[PDB]
Structure 1
Amino acid sequence: YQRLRHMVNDKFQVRSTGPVNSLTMQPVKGRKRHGGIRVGEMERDALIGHGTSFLLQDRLLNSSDYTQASVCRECGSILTTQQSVPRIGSISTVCCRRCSMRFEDAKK
């Protein structure tokens, strides 16, 4: 008998949570970077074929890059919102930028 050289050490990995990417906030790639497992294109089609809309929701939104973000209900935009810089005796709130007209536009 003969023992082959290639062995199964660098083959397993497990991730509960951890590092992300800065652009997408998705789990980073990596065997030794403690990185995520890819639910590819064909597995998206396999999760629709079962009719499991929540396993698709879990494997592609709820456990990858779920962010609760702010949206203006006037211009309909993600990126024009801002949380204001208030008085230290007040509370900040979330406000759109292009829906907001500046205070040197008083008209009468």
Structure 2
Amino acid sequence: YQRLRHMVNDKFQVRSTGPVNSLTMQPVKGRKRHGGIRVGEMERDALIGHGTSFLLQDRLLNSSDYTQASVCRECGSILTTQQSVPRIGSISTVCCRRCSMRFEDAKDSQIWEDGQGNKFVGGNETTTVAIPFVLKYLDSELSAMGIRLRYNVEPK
């Protein structure tokens, strides 16, 4: 009898949380890096056939790259937003860039300033949604190609 070299100490792996891929914010690949295991296209299709929808959403959104992003309700875009630099005692606010003009160009509180010092008044109408970070990455890669994606939010 031969004792083979496929021992169970070199095959088991478990992750609760840990490192994530920087550009997708999804679990890393591999065992020695303490990554995740891929639920692939075929597994997803199997999960659809059962009709277990929340299982599919948990194994493809909730526990992989669920992010509480911000999207401009007026603009309809995800990655054009930005936090406003606070003044003394102020509270930082989420505000749009595409839907905002310079307060300098147009001739109280609806004026926000970015870090460089410019003063804006404009698209202060951004909400928070629940999207995968791969959505933001895809949006960036499409915008770099000259394509815009308007996202319609249910409450407007």
1:11 Cα deviation (Å)?
Answer: 0.6
DSSP-derived class of the 1:38 partner: strand
Gap runs ≥5 in structure 2: 107-155
Runs of 4 or more above 4 Å deviation: none
Superposition map of 1:92-107 within 5 A: 92-106=92-106
Q: Which moved more, 1:52-61 or 1:8-17?
A: 8-17
% same residue: 100
Q: Structure 2 length normalisation: TM-score?
A: 0.65
**RCO (CA 8 Å, sep 6+): is it higher in 1 or 2?**
2
**1:82 match: secondary structure:** strand
* Higher Cα Rg, which structure: 1
* TM-score, length of structure 1 as denominator length: 0.92
Query: How far apart are residue 59 of structure 1 and its match?
Result: 0.2
Shift of 1:78: 0.7
Once the two structures are superposed, residues 29-73 of structure 1 have per-residue CA deviations (whole angstroms, 9 ceiling, x without a partner) of: 111111101100100000000001100010000000000000001
Alpha carbons of structure 1 residues 81 and 53: separation in structure 2 relative to 1, 3 Å:
same
Q: Give the structure with the higher percent strand.
A: 2
Q: Which residue of 1 aligns with 2:22?
A: 22
Deviation at 1:88, TM superposition (A): 2.5
Q: What's the offset of the Cα at 1:93?
A: 0.7
Q: 1:81: which partner in 2?
A: 81
Shift of the alpha carbon at 1:9?
2.4
Query: Which stretch of structure 1 is more off in the superposition, 48-57 or 85-94?
Result: 85-94
